[PDB]
């Protein structure tokens, strides 16, 4: 620590003692329902971009590994989460948004994108988390004479909000003259169909886009990964995983009268004091494991090589053992005899070499 | 069978310090927590509606704005739920919350609502709506209108979820909106995802059997939530016992 | 224009609590005490 | 009456509370919790998020140490004054006016 | 987090600098207390008969009754600072 | 965003914008009509709240620091505009410092030299 | 800029720290003036015949 | 003759002037003007550019406050000395040599 081969007499702060966790406990909801991803991803027909289909996914355990196992998904882009960690997390607010767009419009299904379908058909929020899936659908969503079943809103008065659908087939006024609901000069219908044909190359072919939307930890979760629940252990330093929340601490019984909606317990500094478990609705108080600073009390290396260690602010039962207000001192023998301070320990205790003695 | 039976008069009262709710599901004890959310501002203008049926359309639909604080001093059987939506007809989805003696049914369908909807008592919903098609949500649970007793509710429609908060208070020999704090607790979060711009209260009417329905009255208070920063006091047991509205006056701003 | 440019960006100069007149009055009081009373006024009555 | 000493205690506790409170700051990252960032992102982007958190927390800690040093200088000046008063007022009689 | 520590190592000796500065402040506080109070090398004690020609020093001399061995004024000072 | 007052600055014909010593825009030439305007940003002030203890009273006074009283029991001080305190020609010791020799106290809240 | 303020809020209580430090300096300057000049509680006046 | 007081005024004005000059620094962003970034860039990239400007301006402001604290400490020491001179030279006769 001192970057020297000779250490002078004194007390030196070297490292931090911390008791390590003994085992990992994963607590997940016992309920297991196969999640219906087959319905969303393998559907024969998808909706248009102006009237995009939203399906809610809740109260299921999702295996995302099969999505990878069979996959014509040319584009698999995630924004707020890793693809391989999806099996290890718990979610709520899961939504699958399915629609069909152009080949060149796949860049516009992103937060903050500038476009026609971005503004008037499907808007993403700036703080969006989830994954966008895009795949070519020339084999199913194209016809040789032109498949015109997919329509987009070319014209609208104002931009849409995030996750808002507009299906109103009213006329738009593109010029100074009012249109009064009748088409004519500078009065056009807002919804126009795409000219999808198989003869075109990539970039104009119909593309099926599915947007998976999640929320991260801000509500009780109902969609979880395939991870198995382990048993709960009390009064031991463990690394726990409650619904995707990982922490290292000792779980103890609590006397805090939590309200039925309440799960998390927070102290003055928003530190998670307590947690509730989905599988068993009980409150486990969370306390960080024992730790402290280690100070090495030593005389000069010129004099001796004996050292004593002070664990600061740590009682002697959690690590020539002497308990001081400063901490637990190992390696020094307390002497009743009072002398002047040679190496300061703290709280009136000083150490000296005569063996290393500690005294008031 | 849509019939216009309810007439409604309105007055204006003061909100005092009513309308505080738990903004999240996190236990906090003996702390001061400042949160920014849709809250009913302190001493705000709240409309007191008196709905009278005696034995023309005079019971209009109220706007929803950004969320609604509802209060009632009536018994649990007279006010039986609410109606939420935009057009309140078969072309858009709408939310109907109906409570009875045993449970609550919350249901989102394409209801063709009557102009003056009321549940008439068995109980019939033929005077609430004429048709209900393409129904997309249903949720049945224990009721939140149970048995002088002030009943307070907070309805929010935020990012797809309709959040309902409720509190009951044993009021006595005081103006119906009492002083002091009664924090409302989160009761249900519903993943609805519909557009709500207008709302209406549902009353229960009894058949007369002798002027087809028995004469009755219901009084309720409606206030509107605003984006406001509050400083809430959490006591030893986690209860919100006090709050200061950060933007009400310079003194409270100093406290904030 | 230095003061205006600083003010526009949210930097404000708060006025001193004691004005120059009051500080001058305090110095005048100290001078009157030290001239008419010597060092007695600093240790008790003048 | 004892406002000065209490003020020192008040500043120290407040500084520590501020330093603890700064752990709840995203600092332009997705989350303020490191475990969530690790449990949710791949190392190429988790490294970026952890870098944002590290620079913000390190800046907070340096700010705390700098104000601690300035307060230490002020308290050292006060202690030197107290030692001077102990030597000159307690251990002798002082002819310095108002000292 | 081990990964965070690994990324933290790229910034150099910032942690060592902060620890050294705090250690300097910590030893400085003890030095301040030594300088102010430890100005006598003899622990003097008052005579058992506390008569000083009419002068009463009960409020400033140590109280035998208190376990803390503090004066009434010192006891009041300790109570009033929290 | 700012007030556009009349300008006495004579621009040369090729110049369009104008800048301060601290490189902040202080002038501009109108494109439609060749006239010079002094761009001055809108008034801002530090709102300070003067209050006695809540144990004693809940009355407050507001000091807008640096703001003239015509740009916001209204009294004008060199510190700014003080609203909610009544100026008294009597002089007392300072209880709540306002600035520029003005102090405030509760007896209602009064402001005095 | 409202967007800038929203982004600024993520950094925590830096703004509060800076305001508190400047407020401490501001009250300190007035305290300095009181310590140096307000050392008498009586405003003495010179005789008319100087 | 009166250089010391003038220096104090000059340093304060210079610090304020430097702080205003810091607003015209890009800090590694496309522009030093927030309005230009808002008008020319979509929010994904705008957040990054405003983040760069926020961190640079915040660092400048922190630097200014730290300098002000050190100068305030120096002026406090000078004011304490001035109060000591007022007590011991004006309100009494001092036997301290050269004080
Ligand atoms: C109170 O409401 C509940 C729920 O709507 C009613 O219970 C239902 O009764 C119908 C008969 O029309 C049955 O088909 C359902 O299976 C029942 N559901 C449940 C959950 O019990 C109940 O009848 C209502 N009671 C009154 C007095 O109106
Ligand atoms: C010195 O002062 C102390 C306290 O100021 C005196 O103690 C008081 O004695 C009277 C009469 O005996 C009691 O009524 C008071 O309660 C005592 N005060 C306290 C604080 O205990 C003491 O008498 C004085 N004289 C001597 C010689 O000690
Ligand atoms: C997907 O649908 C095809 C028919 O289009 C069917 O043959 C196949 O079995 C389906 N796969 C799954 C996993 O549902
Ligand atoms: C499964 O979890 C639910 C809560 O989601 C709980 O009510 C139930 O008791 C659990 N099942 C078992 C067997 O513990
Ligand atoms: C409440 O609103 C009504 C009209 O909206 C208004 O006349 C009345 O004065 C308001 N109440 C108060 C206390 O301002
Ligand atoms: C709604 O109902 C009408 C008629 O019952 C039907 O034409 C329409 O397709 C329905 N829409 C949905 C989404 O069920
Ligand atoms: C909600 O409905 C109202 C009433 O038709 C409409 O004006 C408003 O635009 C709708 N809101 C959204 C976000 O579509
Ligand atoms: C909190 O809970 C305790 C224990 O049940 C109870 O005695 C007390 O009255 C409750 N309320 C308050 C305000 O402490
Ligand atoms: C531009 O138009 C305005 C308004 O008609 C006129 O006053 C001005 O002379 C024109 N030319 C220039 C160079 O501004």
Residue numbers in the entry:
A (entry chain C): 302 to 620, 641 to 675, 691 to 696
B (entry chain A): 14 to 23, 27 to 71, 78 to 143, 153 to 178, 187 to 249, 256 to 301
C (entry chain B): 848 to 893
D (entry chain A), H (entry chain B): 944 to 1042
E (entry chain A): 746 to 827
F (entry chain A): 549 to 620, 641 to 675, 691 to 696
G (entry chain B): 746 to 795
Paper text:
The XBB.1.5 variant of SARS-CoV-2 has rapidly achieved global dominance and exhibits a high growth advantage over previous variants. Preliminary reports suggest that the success of XBB.1.5 stems from mutations within its spike glycoprotein, causing immune evasion and enhanced receptor binding. In late 2022, a recombination occurred between Omicron sub-lineages BA.2.75 and BA.2.10.1 resulting in a new variant XBB.1 and its further sub-lineage XBB.1.5, the latter of which rapidly became the most dominantly sequenced lineage in the United States. We find that while the XBB.1.5 maintains a high binding affinity for human ACE2 as similar to previous variants, it has a diminished affinity for mouse ACE2, representing a departure from earlier SARS-CoV-2 variants.
We first characterised the overall architecture of the XBB.1.5 spike protein via cryogenic-electron microscopy (cryo-EM). We obtained a global reconstruction of the XBB.1.5 spike ectodomain at 2.8 Å resolution, finding 2 down RBDs and 1 unresolved RBD. The architecture of the XBB.1.5 spike protein is similar to previous variants such as the Alpha, Beta, Gamma, Delta, and Omicron lineages. The resolution of the RBD and NTD regions of the XBB.1.5 spike protein is much lower than that of the S2 core, highlighting the flexibility of these regions, as seen with previous variants. Tamura et al. recently reported the cryo-EM structure of the closely related XBB.1 spike protein, resolving two different closed states (all RBDs down). The major difference between these two closed states is slight differential positioning of the RBDs in the down state, suggesting RBD flexibility as observed in the unresolved RBD within the XBB.1.5 spike structure presented in Fig. 1C, D.
